[PDB]
Design a protein around this ligand. Structure first.
Ligand SMILES: Nc1ncnc2c1ncn2[C@@H]1O[C@@H]2COP(=O)(O)O[C@H]2[C@H]1O
Ligand SMILES: Nc1ncnc2c1ncn2[C@@H]1O[C@@H]2COP(=O)(O)O[C@H]2[C@H]1O
Ligand SMILES: [Mg+2]
Lengths: 75, 78, 50, 230, 201, 252, 79, 228, 201
């Protein structure tokens, strides 16, 4: 999709969550959605609420978590 | 074009925290005959200078954010 | 103005120190280019196509 | 009701293009009612195959020229609008032509595809005055009906085409001249009955009986809207 | 949209956990809506043992079977899965706004049709399958329910032996033993409360 | 980019939005008028032929100018003062300035005519319509005095109509022409071959009695049919229409 | 009503007062957004003005009465 | 082949006998075709029954007259062309009317066979000024199609007729008028398209919609041999 | 009424005894209404053992779950009890019937209410009571029907041990044995198919 290929700062993320993302080598939103929730919760600084509001904003702009890709990355 | 532009800008400014919007107004001479500075934001808000630079940055995230960008996007082709 | 000042403070975009002065079709017109001619001074480089 | 239908009889091919159709038997008021009504359709809404594009080596625009040739590009193009070609299988073809030597350039010289009929080999195209000179082109033909000019295409077509493709207007409408005559179809008694005799003149490229069949077919297709749709 | 016009009219109460929504047999005089949270519908027997009817998530009008005939009762218990904000509707007003707008019984056509479809395979499975199939397909359907979380090899969910014993119509340690067999069959991971199924999607 | 909604919205705004027309030299106030727009696929204005005369205008290469009533008040003044309906008469004189010019009038004078010669003389009709069946079939002369029945009206009472019917020995084209007339006028007005004057005072009478609007409508019909039957009429000119009197050479 | 403005004049009596009153109403409607009385029928405010004035629903007196009453009641609401 | 077809949009109907039809949209070059051809078949080939001949007692030729009567013979004859008649079993009938008193002679007074419908039974025929005058007539109605005048009929007829039997221009085809109009209708990019607006106005005996339906029915019924 | 307006517009059809009305698995495109007669609902399993779910007489709606959800499959079997007659219309009309007057789906909502509550009594009775309990209670149940015939000491109904075995879900012959137990206790009489029940009224 045209929205697979965006950096996450178009979502206007937060500093703690941003540190969580850059800390975990998660580059593309296609790389985001291929990651699973429990693969996030165990990670540093990602407990209750990061998952809450990131779930909110992805509920806003029409996508969800944990989805599955194929032919990734086209780069 | 200038008018509809500027009104849209102020309508984006309304949605922020107070210090954010007022700082980002007077820091650029917006809405006044003034032209106020990072240093002078130090003088008025509180002497902290470059956290205002980081605040400017954070606001640019808060506002650029392509859910608000698209009233501004027509003005990209300016 | 403070506004566009803020806008390229957002996008970081900029101008050059140069303006456009191109030759264009005037509105309402369409047609077929078939020949071009160029004239240049004895003393300045002939721009390559010349 | 003392109705009676008209039934085809004969076709008299005076020539490839010039040919008439004696047609009978009609009641009163139907000779003209069918004459004009079919004239309009045979003239207006008949399809055919005609050139729409050409492309030539060594050329940018149709106003340019060529060594070893009399004709400007335009005169050749206009000598290609009026070409007579029939396709059977396809809805588009791209032919080619290649020639050298001093002489008149006609259609017999063309790279003919297997599934295409040229009606006249001697549709004159160009003339060659230099021995050494050489011509080579491609010819896109399509199929359609009516008048469809190039300028309406580029008006429609934003596709930034490659320079060289010299574009051409389309007159798909194949019929040229056409008439009818309301004579008196003989029945013994009902001698008010009429025969319609339709004089037809077109290019090649189009069968007459099939033409009439398409005309009447289209007509009935338009009449369903007055019999079925109320 | 539609939902705005209907929440414009409603009266609300906030529900704590651990308690009762519906009391079976009492006068059914109100329809409800799940404003937020989840719930577990169920029913008792003479002896008092519980046997779960289903769970329910967001997007549910609740307490509907009493809407319809004059002088009906509550045909089931409904118990707290979580704390839940819940709406309030009367039935004379139900006549009013079904009449001036027919889209709400279009919605209840949606929900009730789902409920007797899912119940159709509840009883349809209740006839034939074996306990393997009972709890297996049970946890498949709970893997379809959104209350489960995503595990990188499948779906995780948190539940005890007692309540699933109240799902499939058998005892708790029976499902414990066949569960551990199912672990040995390599179709789940299982630590106490937190159980996980793989093979989803 | 000239998208599709451009055109639909153009048609959306233009409706009920009049527009001014002007030809030089703007001698008198009828040289400038307010019409309604009609959109067409061309670069040339069309015009309502009857109002060429107030413009003294012909289609010999002439050019006209267009203005726009932006503000609402000018728009209403246009629809009410500069409108083509409000103005069918001069302030100099009260003559019809809607005088049918030169082609329509030929169609009339050809149609309403009383020959002797063609055919269909002296039968009887129940009204105009089966006459139309005849000529649209092509069975009668268009110009031939024949008996018919008609049904005129009259407002003898307090501006209240007073009906009647009768027979007339009158031509076919006149009967056909009676279809349009608005229920207040005699039949004598059409009972002649309708020279240009007869039509001028026709419209005069229609105005003076009925008020305005039928005189407009009537007139439009009179334009259309006049062209139409004129195209039917057959008309030309040729060297033998010009015939030399034999007795010129000898007077000389 | 659209193409001819006669019956409207037959109601009031003058072209000028007709266009002034009509323009006043359609400026209550073009900007003030107040509702019509005669149906809409997909027409710009000119026609609805001329109709409301044709059938006898709008007049300079009537406009004065309406604006008067709402103004005065507003003055009571202020105090 | 990229034909377009119309969609019958409206049938505006003033009375049972007066009718309007808008019809859009069409490719250019058909509105005049259809309008003309239908106008022809309508006005010259539609079947129907009508007054062919008359026979009255004490009545010899139209230039003569009856006493105690408002009309001459002719105005009556015009009051007979304007007649709504339907035969339902036959192709021919002969009605009778025997009237007395001061009754403005309606068609209602006529004695009707079972297979006859007069759609306008009020239709006036004559007037008996004094009551003492009384009439007996008989009216041939015949089934044909189109229009044919009694003048051309006597031109056609060599078989002897007497003085007393009369003849009228046959109005078989039930139309009184049709006319069509080619306007231009808009498709978004295409204003070169044309609609066909028709006014038909007939006698009784037919609803116009049905008449047109029969016309196009006939015409396709002529075309089936060349759709082949 | 008002049903006159409804069936004035419907498409009408008759069909004989034991014909297959609805096929489990076909698309959701048509509603049906029993105009005259009775019909029986059953289901089918991997094994092919048939299990009668319900049975309904004149004045009831059939084909109701698929009305809303675009493209559902038929969640059960329904076969003719007798030769019987039905009216039918498809779904695109019923949106026109709910948008104009929602009373029809009130009627459907009430019969569907009684439906789902007797389904609650069904799953409970199937759940807890012994074989004698639910066979006895379902015997009491079909004693209610209009199909049931009157007897001076109570009622009498015709049914085989098979089909009653298909509503309780056990073998016909063990139903024979418990039938003998109930004859021994002097509560029911029976010859072949004709059972006669005391205790009613
Ligand atoms: N089979 C079922 N499926 C879904 N919900 C049910 C079922 N049985 C009972 N309920 C719910 O439990 C409620 C108990 O009271 P009511 O009968 O008023 O309405 C009932 C429904 O809301
Ligand atoms: N629990 C049930 N009780 C009664 N009838 C049912 C049940 N489940 C399915 N059916 C019937 O089976 C039909 C299958 O298709 P429908 O859902 O359209 O309509 C259904 C009902 O007629
Ligand atoms: Mg001039």
């Amino acid at each position: 999709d045209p929205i697979l290929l965006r950096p996450v700062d178009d979502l206007e993320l937060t500093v703690r969550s941003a540190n969580c993302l850059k800390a975990e080598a998660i580059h593309y939103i296609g790389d985001l959605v291929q990651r699973t929730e429990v693969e996030l919760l165990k990670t540093p600084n990602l407990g209750k609420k990061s998952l809450t509001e990131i779930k909110d904003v992805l509920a806003s702009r029409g996508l969800s978590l944990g989805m599955r890709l194929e032919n990734w990355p086209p780069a | 074009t200038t008018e509809s532009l500027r009104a849209a800008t102020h309508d984006v400014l309304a949605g922020l925290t107070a210090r954010e919007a007022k700082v980002l107004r007077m820091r650029f001479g917006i809405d006044m005959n003034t032209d106020y500075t990072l240093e002078e934001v130090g003088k008025q808000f509180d002497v902290t200078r470059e956290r205002i630079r980081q605040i400017e940055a954070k606001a640019l995230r808060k506002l650029r954010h392509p859910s608000r960008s698209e009233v501004l996007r027509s003005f990209l082709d300016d | 103005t403070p506004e566009e000042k803020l806008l390229r403070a957002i996008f970081g975009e900029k101008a050059s120190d140069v303006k456009d002065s191109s030759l264009r079709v005037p509105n309402g017109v369409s047609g077929t280019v078939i020949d071009v001619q160029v004239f240049t001074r004895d003393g300045v480089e002939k721009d390559k196509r010349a | 009701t003392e109705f009676l239908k008209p039934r085809l009889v004969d076709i008299e091919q005076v020539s490839s293009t010039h040919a008439k159709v004696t047609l009978e038997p009609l009641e009163r008021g139907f000779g003209h009612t069918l004459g004009n009504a079919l004239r309009r359709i045979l003239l207006s809404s008949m399809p055919g195959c005609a050139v729409t594009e050409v492309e030539i080596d060594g050329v940018l625009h149709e106003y340019s020229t060529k060594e070893g040739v009399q004709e400007d590009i335009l005169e050749i193009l206009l000598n290609l609008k009026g070409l007579a070609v029939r396709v059977q299988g396809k809805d588009e073809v791209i032919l080619t032509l290649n020639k050298s030597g001093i002489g008149p350039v006609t259609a017999a010289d063309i790279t003919h595809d297997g599934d295409v009929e040229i009606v006249k080999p001697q549709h004159v195209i160009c003339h060659l005055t230099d021995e050494n000179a050489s011509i080579s082109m491609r010819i896109k033909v399509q199929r359609g009906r009516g008048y469809v000019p190039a300028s309406t295409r580029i008006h429609s077509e934003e596709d930034e085409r490659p320079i060289g493709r010299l574009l051409v207007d389309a007159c798909y409408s194949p019929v040229e001249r056409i008439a009818y005559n309301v004579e008196a179809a003989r029945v013994e008694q009902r001698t008010d009955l009429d025969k319609l005799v339709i004089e037809m003149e077109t290019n090649g490229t189009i069968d007459p009986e099939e033409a009439i069949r398409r005309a009447a077919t289209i007509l009935a297709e338009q009449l369903e809207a007055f019999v079925d749709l109320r | 949209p539609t939902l705005e016009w209907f929440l414009s009219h409603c009266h609300i109460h906030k529900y704590p956990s651990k308690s009762t929504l519906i009391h079976q047999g009492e006068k059914a005089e109100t329809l409800y809506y799940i404003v937020k949270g989840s719930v577990a519908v169920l029913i008792k027997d003479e002896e008092g043992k519980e046997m779960i009817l289903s769970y329910l998530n967001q997007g549910d009008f609740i307490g509907e079977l009493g809407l319809f005939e004059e002088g009906q009762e509550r045909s089931a218990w409904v118990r707290a899965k979580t704390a839940c904000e819940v709406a309030e509707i009367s039935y004379k007003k139900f006549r009013q706004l079904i009449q001036v707008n027919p889209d709400i019984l279009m919605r209840l056509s949606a929900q009730m049709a789902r409920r007797l479809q899912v119940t159709s395979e509840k009883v349809g499975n209740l006839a034939f399958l074996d306990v393997t199939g009972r709890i297996a397909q049970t946890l498949l359907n709970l893997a379809k329910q959104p209350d489960a979380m995503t595990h990188p090899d499948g779906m995780q969910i948190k539940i005890t032996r007692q309540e699933i014993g109240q799902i499939v119509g058998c005892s708790r340690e029976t499902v414990g033993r066949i569960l551990k067999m199912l672990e040995d069959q390599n179709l789940i991971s299982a630590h106490g409360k937190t159980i996980v199924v793989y093979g989803t999607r | 980019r000239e998208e599709a909604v451009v055109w639909d919205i153009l048609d959306e705004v233009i409706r009920e939005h009049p527009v001014l027309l002007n030809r030089a030299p703007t001698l008198h106030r009828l040289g400038i008028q307010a019409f309604e727009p009609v959109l067409i696929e061309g670069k040339a204005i069309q015009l309502h032929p009857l109002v060429c005369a107030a413009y003294n205008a012909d289609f010999d290469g002439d050019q006209m100018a267009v203005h726009v009533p932006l503000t609402l008040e000018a728009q209403l003044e246009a629809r009410a003062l500069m409108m083509s309906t409000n103005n069918i008469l001069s302030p100099a004189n009260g003559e019809p300035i809607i005088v049918p010019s030169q082609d329509v009038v030929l169609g009339l004078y050809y149609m309403t005519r009383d020959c002797v010669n063609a055919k269909g003389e002296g039968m009887v009709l129940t009204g105009p319509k089966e006459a139309e069946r005849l000529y649209r079939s092509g069975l009668a002369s268009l110009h031939a005095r024949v008996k018919v029945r008609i049904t005129e009206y009259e407002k003898d009472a307090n501006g209240e109509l007073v009906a009647k019917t009768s027979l007339k020995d009158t031509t076919v084209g006149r009967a056909i022409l009676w279809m349009i007339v608005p229920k207040g006028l005699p039949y004598s007005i059409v009972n002649q071959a309708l020279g240009k004057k007869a039509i001028s005072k026709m419209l005069n009478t229609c105005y003076r009695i009925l008020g305005l609007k039928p005189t407009v409508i009537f007139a439009d019909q009179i334009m259309y049919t006049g062209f139409a039957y004129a195209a039917r009429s057959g008309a030309s000119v040729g060297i033998d229409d010009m015939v030399i009197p034999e007795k010129k050479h000898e007077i000389i | 009503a659209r193409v001819t403005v006669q019956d409207a004049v037959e109601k009031i009596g003058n072209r000028f007062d007709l266009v002034l009153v009509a323009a006043r109403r359609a400026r209550q409607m073009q900007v003030g957004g107040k509702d019509p009385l005669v149906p809409e029928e997909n027409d710009k405010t000119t026609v609805i003005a001329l109709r409301e004035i044709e059938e006898g629903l709008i007049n300079n007196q009537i406009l004065d009465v309406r604006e008067r009453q709402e103004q005065q009641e507003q003055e009571a609401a202020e105090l």
